[PDB]
């Protein structure tokens, strides 16, 4: 897994690859690793995937209720404080490693949070088994005052660093852009550089080829 977040002049973009692994096996060649906390606060997750989903949906739900109660738009600094205090409680047993990005009425934000409950702030970040490939690219091509289109390119490339160079990362690139005065823009499969080639054969069986002992139609409706 490789996830990154890059700040640009008017917002923030996060990106992730689409590969879920069980050991050395690829279970999903298109997993969505970009999660929604609120409409303009999004999350990339790495670690135990049940945990990254569990924790973003929980804090997601509490964030919604806080929002309805205070009649205010959700703040990133809140999803941060809530994530980190939940994680810290569980001493890292909740294996969620997270980059949280968003725009709110105070500006644009980018943080990373660790399973144990530590948080970091920066203009560019990465996590995952592709963390290193991605951060090499970011250390090479980042500058302040990125345009939107520049920050997409950058974040997009960094994921490609992990797709190619990291065994744990692969397949497609997912991006979400959240810009200060606009709707969060979510690009599922922004990049698909990994299409499987056409097989050398079709493996359709001639019907009747399987040996059957019993048939019986099944009762759906009571």
């Amino acid at each position: 897994t490789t996830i990154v977040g890059v700040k640009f002049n008017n917002g923030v973009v996060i990106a992730a690859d689409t590969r879920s692994t069980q050991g050395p096996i690829v279970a999903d060649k298109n997993c969505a690793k970009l999660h929604r906390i609120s409409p303009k606060i999004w999350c990339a997750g790495a670690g135990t995937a049940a945990d990254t989903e569990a924790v973003t949906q929980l804090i997601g739900s509490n964030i919604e209720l806080h929002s309805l109660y205070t009649s205010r738009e959700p703040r990133v600094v809140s999803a941060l404080q809530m994530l980190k205090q939940h994680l810290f409680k569980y001493q890292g047993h909740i294996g969620a490693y997270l980059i949280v990005a968003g725009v709110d009425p105070t500006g644009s934000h980018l943080f990373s949070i660790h399973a144990h409950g530590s948080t970091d702030v920066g203009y560019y970040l990465s996590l995952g088994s592709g963390s290193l490939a991605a951060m090499a690219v970011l250390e090479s091509h980042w500058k302040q005052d990125l345009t939107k289109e520049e920050a997409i390119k950058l974040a997009s490339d960094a994921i490609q660093a992990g797709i190619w160079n990291d065994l744990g990362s692969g397949s497609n690139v997912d991006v979400c852009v959240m810009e200060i005065g606009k709707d969060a823009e979510y690009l599922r499969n922004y990049l698909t550089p990994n299409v499987r080639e056409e097989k050398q054969k079709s493996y359709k069986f001639p019907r009747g080829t399987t040996a059957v002992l019993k048939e019986s139609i099944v009762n759906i409706c009571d």
Partner: protein
């Protein structure tokens, strides 16, 4: 990491490298380890980042509640909330904290809280992994009641040595100055402190 706080004539200055590391991999090279728990009460954090951010967050909450009830807390009181959290939870924390702040009654003050939950009031305090290498240097170079410029240099030099030798330290030298004038943030980049 390498952290220190030094008292001088006009107040007190905290310093730190900006490197946090996970093994040999530098997870963050622009870390801010200087942490505000009150207007003129700051801390230097070292140890588990999670343990140490969480402790600071609770102390910030406590002194804020203190403030709304009994006005401004003493540096000594900030140190006490820290000690209390660190001592009573000693089995489940890896935190080494230098607390530093300013009063008009008291001027600059420095408390170090090491792994014990013990608490120690010192004229200056070093801590973090890089600290071992500058024990000798600082003992030969600390003078009481230095000027602000003297003190900023004493920290610059010490921390550049700690960063030089300890690979757990590095990046930028950050400082925070606490005087009656108020609160001043300083930064010093590699190219500057390396060639000293």
């Amino acid at each position: 990491t390498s952290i220190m706080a030094v008292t001088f004539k006009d107040g007190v200055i905290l310093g730190a490298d900006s490197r946090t590391t996970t093994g040999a991999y530098i997870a963050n090279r622009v870390t801010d380890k200087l942490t505000r728990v009150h207007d003129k009460i700051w801390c230097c954090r070292s140890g588990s980042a999670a343990d140490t951010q969480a402790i600071a967050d609770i102390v910030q909450y406590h002194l804020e509640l203190y403030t709304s009830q009994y006005g401004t807390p003493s540096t000594e009181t900030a140190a006490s909330v820290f000690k209390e959290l660190c001592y009573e939870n000693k089995d489940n924390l890896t935190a080494g904290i230098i607390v530093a702040g300013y009063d008009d009654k008291n001027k600059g003050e420095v408390y170090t809280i090491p792994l014990g939950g013990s608490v120690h009031k010192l004229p200056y305090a070093i801590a973090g992994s890089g600290s071992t290498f500058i024990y000798g240097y600082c003992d030969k170079n600390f003078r009481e009641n230095m000027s602000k410029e003297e003190t900023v240099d004493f920290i610059k030099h010490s921390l550049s040595q700690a960063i030089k030798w300890d690979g757990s330290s590095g990046g930028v030298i950050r400082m925070v100055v606490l005087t009656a004038a108020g609160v001043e943030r300083l930064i010093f980049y590699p190219d500057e402190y390396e060639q000293l």
